[PDB]
Amino acid sequence: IAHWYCGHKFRHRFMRDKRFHPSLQASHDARNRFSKRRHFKTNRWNYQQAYRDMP
């Protein structure tokens, strides 16, 4: 591992690699991999009545 990519430590490199790992990719189940936490608890106090046009 060339020492100039990402942080000044090694583990920083592998921590960015995990954003490129094949089995780790974003999808309908695993989403918002890179910031999960900025979006957390965001709609708790947002009250949205669900959609019904059918009785």
Binding residues vs RNA (CB under 7 A): 1-3, 5-7, 9-12, 16, 19-20, 26-44
Q: Residue 28 or residue 52: which is nearer to RNA going by CB?
A: 28
Question: Within 10 A of 17 (CB to CB), how many other CB atoms are there?
Answer: 13
Options 2, 8, 34, 47; binder of other proteins; rule CB under 8 A: 47
Q: Tell which residue, 26, 2, 24, has the closest CA to residue 12.
A: 2
| C-alpha distances out from residue 4 to 7, 9, 12, 15, 19, Å | 7, 9, 11, 14, 18
**Per-residue contact track with other proteins, 1 to 40, x per CB under 8 A?**
--------------------xxxxx-xx-xxx-----xx-
